[PDB]
Design a protein around this ligand. Structure first.
Ligand SMILES: [Cl-]
Ligand SMILES: [Cl-]
Ligand code: NA
Length: 129
């Protein structure tokens, strides 16, 4: 599923991400835009052999099991394919664990390079929330 901007904002609110660990909703919408272009099906292979999955590009070395990343830790205890669903619950639940690990949203490269320090509230402007 390719979400619209405001539709995704509403879904992430319904799932408790607004101000989760102090990150306002716009931060999460901005991260999703630049990680996946709001597409739940997005996948991208990395040089180390791991793969990133879904709307928030969650990595198969640490967070989910894809059966082809040797030494994977599977800290979210889920198959990576579950992160590609039109239902974002599994992605949100795993993201909550990632953002709590100590580095906050700096775990998402695109957030640090394209969202951090910008006017992220623009990503929710106009939306009925
Ligand atoms: Cl959803
Ligand atoms: Cl933080
Ligand atoms: Na915001």
């Amino acid at each position: 599923k390719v979400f619209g901007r405001c539709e995704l904002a509403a879904a992430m609110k319904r799932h408790g991400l607004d101000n989760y660990r102090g990150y306002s909703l716009g931060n999460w919408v901005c991260a999703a835009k630049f990680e996946s272009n709001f597409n739940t099906q997005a996948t991208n292979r990395n040089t180390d052999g791991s793969t990133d999955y879904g709307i928030l590009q969650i990595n198969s070395r640490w967070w989910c099991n894809d059966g082809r990343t040797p030494g994977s830790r599977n800290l979210c205890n889920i198959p990576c394919s579950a992160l590609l669903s039109s239902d974002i619950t599994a992605s949100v639940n795993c993201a909550k664990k990632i953002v709590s690990d100590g580095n906050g949203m700096n775990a998402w490269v695109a957030w640090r390079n394209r969202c951090k320090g910008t006017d992220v509230q623009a990503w929710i402007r106009g939306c009925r929330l």
